[PDB]
Amino acid sequence: KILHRLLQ
Amino acid sequence: ASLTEIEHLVQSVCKSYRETCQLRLEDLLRQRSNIFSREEVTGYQRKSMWEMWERCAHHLTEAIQYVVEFAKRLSGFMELCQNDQIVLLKAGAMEVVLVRMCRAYNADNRTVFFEGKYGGMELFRALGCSELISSIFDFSHSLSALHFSEDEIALYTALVLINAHRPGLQEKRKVEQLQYNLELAFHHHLCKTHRQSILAKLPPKGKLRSLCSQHVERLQIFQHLHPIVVQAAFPPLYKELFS
Ligand SMILES: CCS(=O)(=O)c1ccc(CC(=O)Nc2ccc(-c3ccc(CC(C)C)c(C#N)c3)c(C(F)(F)F)c2)cc1
Numbered sequence: 001k002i003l004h005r006l007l008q
Numbered sequence: 009a010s011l012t013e014i015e016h017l018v019q020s021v022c023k024s025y026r027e028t029c030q031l032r033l034e035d036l037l038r039q040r041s042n043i044f045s046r047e048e049v050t051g052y053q054r055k056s057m058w059e060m061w062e063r064c065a066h067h068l069t070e071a072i073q074y075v076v077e078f079a080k081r082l083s084g085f086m087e088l089c090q091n092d093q094i095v096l097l098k099a100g101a102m103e104v105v106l107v108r109m110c111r112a113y114n115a116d117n118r119t120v121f122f123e124g125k126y127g128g129m130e131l132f133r134a135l136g137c138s139e140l141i142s143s144i145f146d147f148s149h150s151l152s153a154l155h156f157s158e159d160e161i162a163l164y165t166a167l168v169l170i171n172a173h174r175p176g177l178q179e180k181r182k183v184e185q186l187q188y189n190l191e192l193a194f195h196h197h198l199c200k201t202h203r204q205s206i207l208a209k210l211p212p213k214g215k216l217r218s219l220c221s222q223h224v225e226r227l228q229i230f231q232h233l234h235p236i237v238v239q240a241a242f243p244p245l246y247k248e249l250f251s
Contacts, residue, residue: 002245003094006076007086 009192017193018163020083025162028078029108030071033158036112036121043119044127053133058237060134061230067122069243071105078104079169084186088179095176096183098249100169102223103216106144107165110151118145137226143219147211154206163194168216224250 044052052060079085079097086093112121119126132141156164167190172183198204227250231238238247 002248003076003097004090006073006245007080007090007093 009189011196014189014192014196017083017189018159018197021166021190021193022159022162024078024081024083025158025165027081028074029158030074031112031121033111039121039124040114040126042125043117044125044131048125049127049131052127052131055134057134057136057230058234058241060132061234062237062241063123064132064135065242065246068102068105069246071108072101072245072249075101075104075108075169078165082166082169084189085170088182088186091176091178092183095174096169096171099174100171101249102220103168104165106147106216106219107151107168108161109144110148110156111161113145113148113152115149115152118149120145120148135226136230140219140222140226143222147215147219150211154209157201159197160203160206163190163197164210166190167194227251 076097079093079101085096088096109120114120114126117126117128119128122131129141129145135141167187170183170187170190172180172187174183177183195204195207198206231251238251
């Protein structure tokens with residue numbers, strides 16, 4: 001879920 | 009596709025890279041005389057395996073964060089679906105960092121920039137990953153012999169990321185199209201700058217794949233030895249990408 005937060 | 013369109017992509021990719029390159033090349037070059045002393049090296053070697061692993065995982069995570077930003081600013085990337093964005097980053101983020109690392113590598117004395125100073129591979133002996141470390145150093149040495157300009161690193165790393173062969177892609181054709189446009193941009197730039205000689209000297213995909221596989225394997229070995237350390241002390245993003 002960290003990748004997800006970074007992308008938006 | 010016009011020639012003006014391709015040139016526009018070249019400059020867009022180069023700009024995206026400059027804005028996300030982490031350290032300016034000049035700053036890395038200026039610090040090359042700043043080399044860890046024998047005492048500082050011994051200091052690193054006496055550190056515990058798990059502390060050294062944690063430190064390396066943190067710095068990799070920092071580097072990876074800049075690559076994620078590179079991707080976000082990379083023409084076409086955010087137009088791909090989120091599934092594919094994640095697939096490409098999971099498979100390519102570490103590979104990009106490994107390529108970018110040649111900038112911080114000094115081929116004259118075989119040292120790499122790490123925590124403020126330059127040190128050889130003996131610096132990392134506490135990790136217990138001699139084969140991995142020497143492979144990374146060998147890969148960086150091979151890349152250094154090509155004498156990449158910053159623009160070349162920008163274009164080459166864009167292609168390392170935008171790879172339509174990555175398993176798990178839902179919109180393969182869309183990624184294929186962007187990859188092809190970036191290949192044109194990269195190869196056009198090499199043609200214009202009379203640097204097509206480097207194409208044959210670029211390392212095969214398997215070299216980068218090997219490094220990432222070794223990294224994952226050495227992590228698994230370590231995480232078996234110190235599971236609570238990884239759970240408690242490793243960066244969340246690192247675990248998401250590599251565990
Ligand atoms: C990359 C963008 S830059 O602006 O050029 C830049 C920006 C900053 C830096 C400093 C830096 O973070 N160096 C550093 C950090 C960790 C490591 C490293 C250490 C050990 C391991 C094996 C371990 C995980 C079991 C791995 C792996 N895989 C990577 C290295 C180097 F690879 F050299 F050993 C250097 C260097 C360039």
